[PDB]
Amino acid sequence: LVYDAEFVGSEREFEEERETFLKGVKAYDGVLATRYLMERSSSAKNDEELLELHQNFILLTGSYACSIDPTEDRYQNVIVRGVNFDERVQRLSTGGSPARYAIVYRRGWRAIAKALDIDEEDVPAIEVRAVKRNPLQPALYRILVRYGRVDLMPVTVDEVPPEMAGEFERLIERYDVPIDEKEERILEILRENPWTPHDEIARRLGLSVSEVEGEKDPESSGIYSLWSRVVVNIEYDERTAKRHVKRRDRLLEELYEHLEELSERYLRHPLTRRWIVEHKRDIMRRYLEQRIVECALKLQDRYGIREDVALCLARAFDGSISMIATTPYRTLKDVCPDLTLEEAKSVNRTLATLIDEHGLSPDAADELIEHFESIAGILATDLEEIERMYEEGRLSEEAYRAAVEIQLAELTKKEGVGRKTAERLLRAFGNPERVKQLAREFEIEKLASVEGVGERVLRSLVPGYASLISIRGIDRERAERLLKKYGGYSKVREAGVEELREDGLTDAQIRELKGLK
Ligand SMILES: [Mg+2]
Numbered sequence: 001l002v003y004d005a006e007f008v009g010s011e012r013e014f015e016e017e018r019e020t021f022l023k024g025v026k027a028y029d030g031v032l033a034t035r036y037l038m039e040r041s042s043s044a045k046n047d048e049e050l051l052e053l054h055q056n057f058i059l060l061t062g063s064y065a066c067s068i069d070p071t072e073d074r075y076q077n078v079i080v081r082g083v084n085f086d087e088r089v090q091r092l093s094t095g096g097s098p099a100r101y102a103i104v105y106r107r108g109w110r111a112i113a114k115a116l117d118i119d120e121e122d123v124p125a126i127e128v129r130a131v132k133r134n135p136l137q138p139a140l141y142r143i144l145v146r147y148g149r150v151d152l153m154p155v156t157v158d159e160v161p162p163e164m165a166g167e168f169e170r171l172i173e174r175y176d177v178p179i180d181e182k183e184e185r186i187l188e189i190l191r192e193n194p195w196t197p198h199d200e201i202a203r204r205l206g207l208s209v210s211e212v213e214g215e216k217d218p219e220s221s222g223i224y225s226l227w228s229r230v231v232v233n234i235e236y237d238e239r240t241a242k243r244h245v246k247r248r249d250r251l252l253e254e255l256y257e258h259l260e261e262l263s264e265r266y267l268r269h270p271l272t273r274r275w276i277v278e279h280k281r282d283i284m285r286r287y288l289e290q291r292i293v294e295c296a297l298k299l300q301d302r303y304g305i306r307e308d309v310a311l312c313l314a315r316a317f318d319g320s321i322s323m324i325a326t327t328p329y330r331t332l333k334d335v336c337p338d339l340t341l342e343e344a345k346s347v348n349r350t351l352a353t354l355i356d357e358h359g360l361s362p363d364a365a366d367e368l369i370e371h372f373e374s375i376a377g378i379l380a381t382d383l384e385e386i387e388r389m390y391e392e393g394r395l396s397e398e399a400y401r402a403a404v405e406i407q408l409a410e411l412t413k414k415e416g417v418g419r420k421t422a423e424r425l426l427r428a429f430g431n432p433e434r435v436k437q438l439a440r441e442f443e444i445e446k447l448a449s450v451e452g453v454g455e456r457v458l459r460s461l462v463p464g465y466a467s468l469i470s471i472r473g474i475d476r477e478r479a480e481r482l483l484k485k486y487g488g489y490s491k492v493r494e495a496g497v498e499e500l501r502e503d504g505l506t507d508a509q510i511r512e513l514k515g516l517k
Pocket of ligand 1: 093429430434
């Protein structure tokens with residue numbers, strides 16, 4: 001399977017990138033070693049000092065990762081398990097760095113280390129996927145990395161805000177971000193336990209992981225998309241970024257000296273970097289071991305997969321069910337030759353949907369899985385982009401038509417939207433997710449500017465709009481202004497009488513609004 005990329009900036013920019021990656025490797029090494037130490041004894045395991053050290057390594061790995069490709073243009077032809085990542089990120093509305101996009105995937109460092117000439121023998125791993133012991137809300141942590149948020153990644157555990165962890169919804173509320181109905185289902189689970197694994201959330205909501213996760217772009221649906229919506233609204237703080245970068249190298253050194261000192265409790269020979277290098281492969285295996293077992297068990301018990309295949313797929317994707325669920329049938333078969341199509345459809349539900357619902361050959365479904373990852377990845381892509389790929393010759397007729405039908409149905413599903421209106425909405429606004437974003441933000445006039453989008457379509461698409469506009473003498477202009485002012489319908493309805501009067505409502509209208517009389 002191909003992992004590759006090339007360096008495309010200046011010599012200066014090259015030396016910078018190299019230094020950063022190696023500092024990130026150094027930090028990831030501390031993640032692995034402390035985890036190794038935590039499993040080495042059981043007094044170790046309940047050692048709060050040891051857990052904080054392990055969390056400080058996670059933050060510093062996070063921080064260094066955030067610093068990759070600061071100009072978003074230093075890397076090209078980023079390929080990860082055969083997938084072109086340049087194309088993947090450029091099709092998202094916010095674009096961004098394809099190298100950091102890569103890093104947020106298991107094994108994504110292999111591509112990036114190659115661009116930078118770091119010997120495979122060094123095993124220069126960086127991973128930023130920690131869930132259970134992550135000091136940050138995990139989806140957020142990955143989103144900070146994706147977006148290169150050196151300003152936002154805390155550089156010490158004592159410095160993590162509660163709004164980035166146990167009180168993470170404060171951050172969402174702070175930037176007034178609209179949340180879809182699916183996302184509110186997600187949030188009910190997350191409020192209770194911010195560190196709930198994504199596959200557990202999916203299980204409880206009866207959804208796939210890709211449905212829960214969404215694309216790492218504002219114009220999607222699910223936790224990644226929600227966080228991306230928050231993060232791109234937080235203006236970059238250059239000074240804080242500089243302070244973090246300025247502190248972090250010394251912090252890393254102190255972590256190592258703490259590591260060595262702490263380890264004199266649970267080992268016989270001290271734990272140095274030299275011991276890391278020597279034992280690197282073993283500690284990488286110890287790190288993954290429980291993930292792999294858990295994934296295998298699930299694939300067998302939850303998706304009916306044969307026991308030998310279950311285990312073969314777990315090891316191949318480092319225990320990540322979410323990844324297996326978004327890998328082309330041909331990539332799955334590549335790494336695990338005994339796998340059947342039926343088993344592949346069982347765990348890859350985009351695959352099963354495309355084949356069963358849309359009449360695609362495994363091969364034509366794989367085109368879409370390769371290019372878009374999932375049904376959610378298709379919904380997040382501009383129709384014109386998909387069309388262009390089919391013009392270019394890079395997407396079969398059959399794959400293109402299913403994509404269009406998938407996009408149209410996300411709209412025709414709503415009362416009053418026919419195929420043509422739906423096609424017009426996609427030409428005007430890009431994709432179905434962007435249409436729903438505009439509706440969540442009450443952009444009634446903008447939405448009504450497209451031919452075919454009268455009162456009916458608005459009533460189905462815009463939440464609260466139907467409720468407000470049925471109050472007599474409130475008009476489309478005022479509904480929009482009201483919905484934007486208070487933040488939605490419940491909030492217009494609970495407004496104070498006096499402030500509603502200054503909005504121009506009569507007492508008869510407020511009375512009716514409030515359900516009085
Ligand atoms: Mg757009």
